[PDB]
Amino acid sequence: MTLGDLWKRRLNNCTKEEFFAYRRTGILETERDKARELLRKGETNMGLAVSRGTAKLAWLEERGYVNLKGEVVDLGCGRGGWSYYAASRPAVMGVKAYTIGGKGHEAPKMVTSLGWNLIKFRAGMDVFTMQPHRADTVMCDIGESSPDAAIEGERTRKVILLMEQWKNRNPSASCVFKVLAPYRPEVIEALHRFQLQWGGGLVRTPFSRNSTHEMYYSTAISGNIVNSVNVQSRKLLARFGDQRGPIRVPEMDLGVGTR
């Protein structure tokens, strides 16, 4: 059993009030009150982020931890926060975005955020059985949270396998992907194999709630995986009991228009 496994157990042991206080303590949280209502009312002329994913990917890019360029694929795009972010980047030439949709899953949000015309959305697509194609940048933000850490580990393992499939098709592609449960043993093993062949490393974004152990893998960074994970597990365990609130920051606004 790992420190991350214990983090999951203590998280599940929280009351509802404890859970709500814990998940937000010390995290950056974008102010979405305006964006939420524009989406609710059916407004399409908006560059405010369609989800909390936009600021996460923007932080990775702005830190230089990811390179978004060329033909981008967004595997598991959901509402599209990463697809709209990539499409707004001048170095990006096109985005092909895929998501399963269906009951209890987000469909793409359709807005005029800058470069929307360069995104081709496909809902109803399972990326785990879809053949890879040419891409310069491969993005994947899949990993559905569960109270069962073993299920989270298996979900994470499937994402890593998918990224190996896309690297087999595109050995030179930049890759950025969510690792939902980095502490599970089959995940560490899979990340070690990925890093051995393709380089890269893990990083925690400051927008990630303490209720998820998610870390992002990118081929553009480095670092010992086991140490990266254990540092993060210890930090999450130490935050149980902190009552400080989140740090509220403005939401990303990418502007609107075609590219």
Ligand SMILES: Nc1ncnc2c1ncn2[C@@H]1O[C@H](CSCC[C@H](N)C(=O)O)[C@@H](O)[C@H]1O
């Ligand atoms: N097998 C699969 N094939 C395609 N999409 C999947 C999938 N499994 C999960 N997904 C979808 O992947 C999405 C991951 S959440 C993605 C959030 C996005 N990066 C943003 O910024 O808004 C979810 O919407 C989920 O429905």
